[PDB]
Structures are given as structure tokens and as C-alpha cells.
Amino acid sequence: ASPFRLASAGEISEVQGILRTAGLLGPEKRIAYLGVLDPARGAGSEAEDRRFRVFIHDVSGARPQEVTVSVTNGTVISAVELDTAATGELPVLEEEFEVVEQLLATDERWLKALAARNLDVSKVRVAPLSAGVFEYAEERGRRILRGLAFVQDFPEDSAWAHPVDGLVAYVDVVSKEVTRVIDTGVFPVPAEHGNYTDPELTGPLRTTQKPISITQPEGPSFTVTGGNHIEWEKWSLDVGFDVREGVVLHNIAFRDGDRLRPIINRASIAEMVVPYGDPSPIRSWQNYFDTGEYLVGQYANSLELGCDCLGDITYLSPVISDAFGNPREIRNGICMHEEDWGILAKHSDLWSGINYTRRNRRMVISFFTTIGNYDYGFYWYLYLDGTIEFEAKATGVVFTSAFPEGGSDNISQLAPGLGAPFHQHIFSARLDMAIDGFTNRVEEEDVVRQTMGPGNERGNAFSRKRTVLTRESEAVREADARTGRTWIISNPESKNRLNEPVGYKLHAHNQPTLLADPGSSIARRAAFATKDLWVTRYADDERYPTGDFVNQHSGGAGLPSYIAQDRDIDGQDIVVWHTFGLTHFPRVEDWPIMPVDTVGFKLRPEGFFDRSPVLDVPAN
Amino acid sequence: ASPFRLASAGEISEVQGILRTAGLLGPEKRIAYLGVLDPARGAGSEAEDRRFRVFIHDVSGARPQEVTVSVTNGTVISAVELDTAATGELPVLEEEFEVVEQLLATDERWLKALAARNLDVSKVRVAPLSAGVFEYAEERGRRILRGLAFVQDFPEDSAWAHPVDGLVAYVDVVSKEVTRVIDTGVFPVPAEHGNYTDPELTGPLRTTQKPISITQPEGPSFTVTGGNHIEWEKWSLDVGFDVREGVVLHNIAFRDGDRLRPIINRASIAEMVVPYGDPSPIRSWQNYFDTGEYLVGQYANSLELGCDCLGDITYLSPVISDAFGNPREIRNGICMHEEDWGILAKHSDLWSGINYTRRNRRMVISFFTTIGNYDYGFYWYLYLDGTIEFEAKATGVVFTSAFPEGGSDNISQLAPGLGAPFHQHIFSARLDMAIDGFTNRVEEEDVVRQTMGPGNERGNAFSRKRTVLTRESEAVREADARTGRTWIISNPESKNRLNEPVGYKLHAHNQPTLLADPGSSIARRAAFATKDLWVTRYADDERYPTGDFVNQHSGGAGLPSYIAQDRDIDGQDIVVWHTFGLTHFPRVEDWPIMPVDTVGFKLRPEGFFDRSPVLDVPAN
Ligand SMILES: [Cu+2]
Ligand SMILES: [Cu+2]
Ligand code: NA
Ligand code: NA
């Protein structure tokens, strides 16, 4: 039955066949995005209609199309020609990555710049970087990538050690033309290598680490059915995968006694942006929407056993479309395992003589992706006690530049002559809430300090206040760590045994949000990133906080356009969008390859249950 | 040799013998505190002088003494009579716990109160609670405990389910007198039981949890020598234990190449307070300094294998003094183990063809203690990449009251008629810094936003600023999560290869600090808790942010008195005191026994190293 099952190779081939049959997938066409659509609200009562949405690019320069296909019925539901100057360019194609370097290698301006620096063109790698929207009027309606150069001394060398600063180029990847080459002047190209497998740099490897072995002799405590339905320690969910978003969780519910209680209908990372804070013209245009522009799912790594995922691992191998509509498996792209998580509850009571200890566990669902120099791990955790958590793990190699003589307010030094521009990694979690069903609301909860006086003569009292967010116009919220600000999603028609609305409380890390000036291009294109929390009324076409087409797309779509509708959110089907990020001032310890740093958020039950939900956990 | 070794049973017996011989430990004397003193600055060049400090109480009502003993030389160094009205009462004695209930059981006012509620005196437990300092002039100079009552239906019942609100009593535990019994009126005593081992409440226990087995077939990668010296993955430290503070880490250093580089000289939790925010006269005096008043070390649990600590565990069994000066072992009171900690670093490089993944690990040093209804786990972690972290795990049973008819702004409902007053758990970490040696300083680092304009035409730039804290008068700092505020401890005379001062950056969680009105008794007695970060000049007698004697002690000592000295801290031997806590509005899920909640902080290297320190970690 399962309407939330992963796409199969056969479904993708059939989408390809349907498109071909319909005249939409001739030899000049390329698939820039393909994904299964979630079933509509209700209609789980009806027979399956598996629908797939496709963005089709044309390499001969004709307008791209957005297409919805019913794979069940073998039909095209809708196909519309896109005006990209207005609505955005399609996501970057994997086949365009190589094009920037290739076009530049025969360009006389680029060659003159390399020759001024005594760099062999055969050794110069060019990063294929998203262009954004700035002052270049000729780029409007064209697919442009910008290129920054890095020297590779030999095939196995880490090019990131040798940035070529002072030089940037812009390229039209469809007409195969170089539009501009800007050379503001030579900077020394940093000379030390960054080869973290070279024994001259590592020194002799440690022989001190004795093995750790994590096994489950009876296997894992979770089950997988219908390909992607998980049942684990009262939790129930479906693990989805989308080429843009990566791992998506559907139908997160908890079995409380006999009743399956919904909590979250859909949880995803719906956008992630990496804005750079170096004002040099060489990099001041740099903002990488890894999700919206590049598609993080498509670059998911195949995860090796004992290296990437440790313990008794169950893998999913999601299927995506290549550029021609053929299915491609990402072997072992999603890890699922349970792990010990320390003490769950402990008490040694003097009066009763009873000593009690129980252990915690969490279910882990993860993938790891690679976008250029960056590598990100996306982890979802379900805990025994009802807690839901997300964590991103950032690693890879830092994006480099020259380190200016005389220093910089916007770049860190990593090695002689080698710099790392300041930047942020900012995520948007889209949480289509379903706390005991879809009739939900959100309150902002602050701690309330109280003045010494009548009613409070000793000046010890403190309290809290909750403010219901009633309509979308008042549901754009900032953090306030000093007052312990959180947000509670509740169901006003579902009460616990103490007659209080059931709820879950979101605990944020209260890290800085987008730092750019509010008048900047990035502040408009990544508007979501300027505030910690947004609440909208659910609509099927409001999927990403940046809109459907982010590449070279101005403001006009996404969250600011959604909330303008000012819809009722007080006891309605609502979606929480939480912004959270890392602000990175690179340190010498990040070089030549960076140790993982993390960021995330969690939600804990708040009167959802009638008492602790883990009283039935056994000892030892 | 080891001058930081744990106290042995023999040393404690010898302290007892020295005190006896000197006329200081006759039959009326009781030891309220005993601990080894750290060796003085320098003088590691000289022969050992193991000194022990003792607080001696007199049950016949004579003044207590503070005593310093050289166990090496068999001498009393100093002995001074204490005026407790001025300097504070000695910590609560374990033998006083039972006294409050015992005295009250034959008091006619208490009996009249129990009879008004139809409660059998034989079933009424009385919590022995610290008294603090309020308006009762007769308590000044006397050792007072206050008592709140909880009914125990039968020997194995959890009394916390049945609070007797409306009733409090005060008791002089030396003269064995009841000074006051206050009955403001009857409240219903909540009737449901809170017995989390009763199958009627748990239901049938889960049979779904398959085993997890964590083993190390070649044993752990750390070594223990001289009883308590740890060497693990370039780290070196000594694990101390003190009856007040619990586990204390000494001499945290990292072996970078051939050179042993100090980082932290002493790390401890030097205080922890639990202030309550219910303005009722029954509880408005309630603030439990678990460290300062009760001594968390002395109530350390014996930790069972496979239950409390999982994996290949090495235990320490610290020795403390009983009330008469006899040694008592806390069997298996400290756990030490290493554990896997996910991915350390990962990169899959397109240009080089090299795919690289390494795993992280941490060394864990922990203990768990029980103070009445609360149980706390204290965990220190050392990571491969140089990160140092502390985490507290709070669990146990919530402290209860009646839930008022018509509700409360300062109490949560847990069950019919059962309330849980709001409260905080606030810790002070004392970090006697030694970043590459003792010449250290502290800077406050904020993110700096930048205006779009000349130099920043695209409005993308952002930066940071560092402010040196030069003297103690300017080193009392608050959090600012919005600006990403951290604090960097550096050594201005020790530079990395890039000519920047080596340092470590403290990352706080930016949770709310003490909420009480600044004019309250708790705001003065727990002044440390009102600000996130303090920096002092090291002095051997500045051990606790609350002073040596916290019990029934007003303001006058501790951190506000230390910083008044306004000493130079810019490139000197300094101590960082970080306040961090949990603000707890109890939820129904906390009842009848609470799932662990956590709080903590970490410090990460910040130009301490010349490049990543984990390039020599091997694969797989
Ligand atoms: Cu970064
Ligand atoms: Cu609490
Ligand atoms: Na919803
Ligand atoms: Na110091």
C-alpha cells in the first residue's frame, strides 16, 4: 500500500517514459530536479496517486519547464514553460561543474591572468560557484556560474591550499561563453600543501587507539517494513529522500498505550545557505544555497561500514534521476541505527530504600553529503522519552583566499599567506506540525522575572508567560536567550488528563542569525535566515523558505511572500520554520581539514503525555 | 612521588590521629568537612607536603574550628575558632538529616498540625532542608534546619507523591529544640502514588529492547598510573576527588609533539544552587546549595557495571572521612571510559579523488550524586581535537507541593492536587586557567555587524571584536547570544607559528541566570549566579564563589568580595568562574521520576595549535 515509500528505479524510468511519450524529454532536455510529491491532505482514504515533479532544462537555449507527472496513471498532469528572469533559474546541473574550467582554459583574458601569476593552465582548477543576483544586467535570464581558481600541483594535491586571489570570472554555461574576467591584481599564491594524507604533514600515525566494538547480538530493536517504514520503541515514521532536501521524515508518531498519536507530519531541512562576509569584489557575491541551488540529496555520499556509521547499521539506498531520466542508486546513502544514550532516569531514595537506574537510547537516521569543499552530515534523533532532535555536522575543507599583508577584519589566517573568509552556515528546518493531529497552534514562552514586593516579599518568585501567535503577520519571531525563550506547539482540542492542551516545546540554540546588512541581496534572497522562527498556514505549494527556484532569483518568493497572506494559525494546520546556523571565523585548527562542528535544535514533550512515557523501560 | 594523588585511607586515619594527639578531636567533636589541599604554586621542586583542611563541629555547643594539618610532618599547621554568626555555619552533617523528623515527632505543635490533617505521625517523613538567612534574629549563630513534610503510606512508598503543604517547622539541631512550627492552613494531601517500580503504574515492561554491547577486546586506550594520573590520546591529567566539590581535574595538559602543554590547572564545579520561585511562605526560603551546604562528593553513588556506566570501565574508589575521622571508601564512585563520538573529519574531494573519513572519541570522567530528591551526574569530556567539555545530567524526583485550586503562576501541576514549584539548578565551574602556562588573559569576543556603504558596497561583510578584561573590576560579564558572545583565554607571551597568541574559547549555552529579585537574600548569597562570567586573579584562599562557609551565611564573602581587590588580570595567573544553569518549569513528563535534562559548556582550542591536532589519527 505505502504511499510514502521511497521512489523505486522503476518509477523513475516510468516518469522518463511518460515524459518522452508526451514530447517533453527529447535529446536536448535534461532533468535538473525530480522528486515524488507527498500525497494531498486526506485522500489516504482513496487509491494511490504517485505524482512526481520535474524541472526540465534545455541545452539548446529554449525555456525550461516545470512538469507534474502521474506515474500511477501514465499521464502528464501539468507542464508549464518557465520565464527564468522572473521566477528563477533551475538548480545547477552536475554536468555544469566542469564547464566553468573548460571554457576559461581557452579564454585570452583568463590565460593572461594566469600567465601574470606564472601558473600553468593545466594545473588550475576552477570552482563552479553559484552567481546570485547583483548589478550585472546581462545575467538576467541567463544561466551564469562564477569561477574562482585554485592551483593543483599534481593530481592528488588539495587545491584549496593554493587559492588564486585577485581573479574571478563569470560564464554563461548554456551559450558556452565567458562574459567577464576580473583581475584586480596579483596576490601571492600560498605555497604550503594541505595534504592531510601525506605522512610528511601527519607525521607517524597514532598507534594508541585500541578498538571499540559496538554490536547487537540479537540485531537492532527497530523494524523496517515497506522499504522505509520504521517502528522503534513506540515511535513510528517513514524515512523519505528527496534529491533537493535529502532525508525527509514523514508521519512521526508515538504509540501511547493503544493509540498512535501524531507529532510531526513532515520534517526536513528545506534550505541551507552559506553567506560569506569578505567585502573583496573577488568574493563579496558568494552565497551558496547548498539545498536550493546545488541540491544536497544528489551529492549524498555512499557510507562505508565501520568508518561512516558504527554499530549494527541498516541502510537505505535511495534512487534519484540522472540528467536524462535514468535511475541512479545512491548505495548505502542513508544510515539507520539505535545507540545507547547514557542514563535515562536515576534515583536513590533514602526513605523508600529503592535505587533505580534506567538507560536511554536514541534512533538515528542520517546521511552525509559533499558540495565542493564542504561536507555535511544531517542527523535526526528520536529518544525514548519523546524528544526529537536534529543535528548538522559541518566538516570538509575551509574555503580559502589569500591572507592580506597587514591582516584583515573579515578573513582569518590559516598558514603563511593563506586566508579563510568569514562566513555562516544557516539551516531552515521545516516542521509541518501535527501535534495529536493537525489542529495546532504556537505560543512563544518567555521566563518572567518578578519584583520584590507584596505577594513576593522575599523576592524569590519567578514565572513565565505564553503568547499565542494568532495570524501569520505576528508569527515572525526572534530568539531571546536571556529570557529563556522557547516556542510551544500545542493542540487546543486535545487535552491531557490534567485538562491542559498537549504540546511539544522547541528549544533552539540561539546562535546568531544572518549577519548581512538588511539592504543586501543576500538579506532579501535568504530572508528566512534573518529571523529564528516563522509560522505559516500549511499550503501544498509552500515547500521551501526561498521558493522553488533559488538560483539567480531575486526576492519575491518564499517566506515573506507566504506570510503576507496573513492567514489564521490559531488552531489550524500549521508549519514551523526554524532558522539555525553556525557563524564561522576559521581557526588554524580548521586547517588543512576541519574537525566537525555542530548545530541543531530539539523538541521535547510538554504535557503531551499523562506522566513520564518511559516508566515501562526495563532495567539492565 | 605524585602530589596530586587521591587521599588514601591511611592519610585520613593519620589526620584523625594528629588531631587527637593535639587535643582537637575529643568525643564531642565531629568532622563536617575534610579534604586534601592542592600544593602551593611552585614548590613542586621541593619534597611533598600533604596538607589537609578540616572543619570540626562540636555537638556540645562549643564553637567549631577550622584546622590545617600536615599529614607528612604529623603537625597541626593552624587551628582557629570560628564565630559562625559572622563567617557562616559549617556544612550540614549527615547525622543531622534524621534529627528534624525525630524532634518534630514529639512536638505538640507539629502533632496538632498532623492531627488536623488526619496523618499518622509514624508515616510522616520530614525533609532536612537548609535554612538560609531571613528575618528570624534568633537563628543567627545557631545551626538550624527547616523541615517540610511528606507522607509515606508504607515503607517502600515514594513520599514525594504526598507533600503536606501549609506546614513548615524550624529546628535547632544542636540544642535539639523546635524553634517554630508554622501552619497556614490545610491543603489536601495528594493521594495518587508515585511508585515507578509498581507494575500497576509502569504497566507490563517493554520486551522490545534488544541488547547493545560495547566492548574493547584489547582494553581501553587510556592508562592510569599513580592511582589517578590519566594519559589518553595526547591528554594528561590527574583526577582528584573532594567531599565538597566531587570530581576535580588537575593539570589538564596536551602533548603537542614532544612538549607537554598545560591548558587548565584546576577544573571543578565549585558551587551549585537550587533556588525556588514559589512565593508561598512554606517554600519561599528554599535555596539548596548542594555543593556548599550539603557537600556533593559525600553523597556520590556507588556506580554499578552495565547500569550506570556502560562499556569497558575503569573505576576509582575515592576515600572520605566519616563524622569521627575514620576513612570510608566510596566503592566505584568515579567512572572513567573512552567512547566513540561519531565522525571527526570527513572530506570527499572531486579534484584529488581522495576520500577521507576519521572517527572521533572522547574520554569520560564522571560521578553521580544524590541529595534528597535530586540526583545529578557530573561528566567531564576530553575530545581528540582538544575540546574540553562539562555536562551535568539532572534527574531524580521533582520537589513537590500542593497544586492550588484555581492554579498558580509559580507551580506546575503533575497529578491531581500535586504541584511542582518552579526552580533553577545553577552551577559555577571554577577553571583555574593555565593556557601554555600561567601567564593568561581573557577577552570577550562579539560578532560585529557592518553597514552597507563604502568598503562594503554589497552589505555582506561581518567581523568580530575582542575586548581584553584588564582588571577584576571590569571582568564581571553577561551573555549575549544574539552577538555570539564567547570568551577567549590566551597566553600573550606564547605565540603559534602564525604569530598569534595561543588560546582556548569558552562556548556557553546562554541559559538564563539567577531570576530572583536583586534585593533578595538569595541574590546576595548566590551573587555569582547573577552573571555568566567572572575573572579573578588566582589566590590560594579563593576556592568557592560563595566562600568557605555557605550554610546560614549572609552576603560578605565569595566572588563579590574577591573582585573588589581590583587586581591586574592582563597576563597573570587567573581563574574563570562560569555560571550556567537550568530553569525548570516542571512538566507532567517529569513525574513520577524525571528523565535526564542537561546543561553545560565547552572550551575549544583557538589558535592553540599550529594546524589541526588530529592529522595523525589513523583510519578505521
Ligand atoms: Cu564554515
Ligand atoms: Cu529541576
Ligand atoms: Na501542520
Ligand atoms: Na590560573
PDB file of N, CA, C and O in Angstrom, chain A residues 24 47 50 57 91 94 179 181 253 275 311 354 391 491 509 536 549 590 607:
ATOM      1  N   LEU A  24       8.110  15.795 -24.131  1.00  0.00           N
ATOM      2  CA  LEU A  24       8.738  16.699 -23.164  1.00  0.00           C
ATOM      3  C   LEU A  24      10.174  16.346 -22.823  1.00  0.00           C
ATOM      4  O   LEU A  24      10.831  17.072 -22.052  1.00  0.00           O
ATOM      5  N   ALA A  47      -7.415   5.431  -3.497  1.00  0.00           N
ATOM      6  CA  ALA A  47      -6.305   4.682  -4.081  1.00  0.00           C
ATOM      7  C   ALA A  47      -5.112   5.609  -4.302  1.00  0.00           C
ATOM      8  O   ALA A  47      -5.275   6.828  -4.458  1.00  0.00           O
ATOM      9  N   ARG A  50       0.642   8.313  -7.183  1.00  0.00           N
ATOM     10  CA  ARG A  50       2.025   8.710  -7.057  1.00  0.00           C
ATOM     11  C   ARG A  50       2.306   9.719  -8.161  1.00  0.00           C
ATOM     12  O   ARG A  50       2.284   9.393  -9.348  1.00  0.00           O
ATOM     13  N   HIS A  57      15.421  21.164 -18.085  1.00  0.00           N
ATOM     14  CA  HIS A  57      16.280  22.170 -18.702  1.00  0.00           C
ATOM     15  C   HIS A  57      16.502  21.809 -20.188  1.00  0.00           C
ATOM     16  O   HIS A  57      16.430  20.645 -20.576  1.00  0.00           O
ATOM     17  N   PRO A  91      17.941  24.719 -10.714  1.00  0.00           N
ATOM     18  CA  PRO A  91      19.144  24.333  -9.953  1.00  0.00           C
ATOM     19  C   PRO A  91      20.351  24.000 -10.845  1.00  0.00           C
ATOM     20  O   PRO A  91      20.190  23.491 -11.965  1.00  0.00           O
ATOM     21  N   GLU A  94      24.755  18.944 -12.441  1.00  0.00           N
ATOM     22  CA  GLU A  94      26.067  18.358 -12.154  1.00  0.00           C
ATOM     23  C   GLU A  94      27.006  18.486 -13.350  1.00  0.00           C
ATOM     24  O   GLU A  94      28.210  18.695 -13.164  1.00  0.00           O
ATOM     25  N   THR A 179      31.546  35.685 -20.008  1.00  0.00           N
ATOM     26  CA  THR A 179      31.035  37.061 -20.018  1.00  0.00           C
ATOM     27  C   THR A 179      31.961  38.088 -19.426  1.00  0.00           C
ATOM     28  O   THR A 179      31.971  39.233 -19.881  1.00  0.00           O
ATOM     29  N   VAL A 181      35.945  38.598 -17.117  1.00  0.00           N
ATOM     30  CA  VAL A 181      37.098  38.149 -16.343  1.00  0.00           C
ATOM     31  C   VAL A 181      37.619  39.386 -15.621  1.00  0.00           C
ATOM     32  O   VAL A 181      38.035  40.343 -16.259  1.00  0.00           O
ATOM     33  N   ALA A 253       5.089   9.722  14.675  1.00  0.00           N
ATOM     34  CA  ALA A 253       4.024   9.495  15.625  1.00  0.00           C
ATOM     35  C   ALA A 253       4.569   8.629  16.766  1.00  0.00           C
ATOM     36  O   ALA A 253       5.609   7.984  16.642  1.00  0.00           O
ATOM     37  N   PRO A 275      26.504  32.140   3.463  1.00  0.00           N
ATOM     38  CA  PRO A 275      26.894  33.500   3.066  1.00  0.00           C
ATOM     39  C   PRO A 275      28.293  33.880   3.537  1.00  0.00           C
ATOM     40  O   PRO A 275      28.640  33.613   4.690  1.00  0.00           O
ATOM     41  N   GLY A 311      28.406   0.367  14.427  1.00  0.00           N
ATOM     42  CA  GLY A 311      27.414  -0.434  15.126  1.00  0.00           C
ATOM     43  C   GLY A 311      26.655  -1.326  14.161  1.00  0.00           C
ATOM     44  O   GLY A 311      27.101  -1.582  13.041  1.00  0.00           O
ATOM     45  N   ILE A 354      14.673   2.344  47.833  1.00  0.00           N
ATOM     46  CA  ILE A 354      14.720   1.875  46.450  1.00  0.00           C
ATOM     47  C   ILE A 354      15.722   2.683  45.644  1.00  0.00           C
ATOM     48  O   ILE A 354      15.703   3.918  45.656  1.00  0.00           O
ATOM     49  N   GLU A 391      20.572  17.452  14.266  1.00  0.00           N
ATOM     50  CA  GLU A 391      21.944  17.926  14.388  1.00  0.00           C
ATOM     51  C   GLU A 391      22.623  17.888  13.016  1.00  0.00           C
ATOM     52  O   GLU A 391      22.602  16.849  12.309  1.00  0.00           O
ATOM     53  N   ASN A 491      -2.059  21.428  20.701  1.00  0.00           N
ATOM     54  CA  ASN A 491      -3.351  21.113  20.095  1.00  0.00           C
ATOM     55  C   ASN A 491      -4.397  21.593  21.081  1.00  0.00           C
ATOM     56  O   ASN A 491      -4.568  20.964  22.118  1.00  0.00           O
ATOM     57  N   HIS A 509      19.148  26.804  19.892  1.00  0.00           N
ATOM     58  CA  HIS A 509      20.473  27.062  20.384  1.00  0.00           C
ATOM     59  C   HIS A 509      20.765  28.556  20.475  1.00  0.00           C
ATOM     60  O   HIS A 509      21.748  28.928  21.104  1.00  0.00           O
ATOM     61  N   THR A 536       3.690  29.481   9.392  1.00  0.00           N
ATOM     62  CA  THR A 536       2.706  29.627   8.339  1.00  0.00           C
ATOM     63  C   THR A 536       1.566  28.646   8.457  1.00  0.00           C
ATOM     64  O   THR A 536       1.678  27.581   9.088  1.00  0.00           O
ATOM     65  N   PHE A 549      12.574  28.107  -7.048  1.00  0.00           N
ATOM     66  CA  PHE A 549      13.728  28.399  -7.897  1.00  0.00           C
ATOM     67  C   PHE A 549      14.574  29.508  -7.251  1.00  0.00           C
ATOM     68  O   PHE A 549      14.216  30.695  -7.278  1.00  0.00           O
ATOM     69  N   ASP A 590      41.254  24.441  12.029  1.00  0.00           N
ATOM     70  CA  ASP A 590      40.375  24.005  10.933  1.00  0.00           C
ATOM     71  C   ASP A 590      41.143  23.571   9.676  1.00  0.00           C
ATOM     72  O   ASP A 590      40.556  23.032   8.743  1.00  0.00           O
ATOM     73  N   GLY A 607       3.600  18.387  28.474  1.00  0.00           N
ATOM     74  CA  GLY A 607       2.217  17.979  28.731  1.00  0.00           C
ATOM     75  C   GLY A 607       1.557  17.147  27.630  1.00  0.00           C
ATOM     76  O   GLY A 607       0.337  17.024  27.584  1.00  0.00           O
TER      77      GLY A 607
END
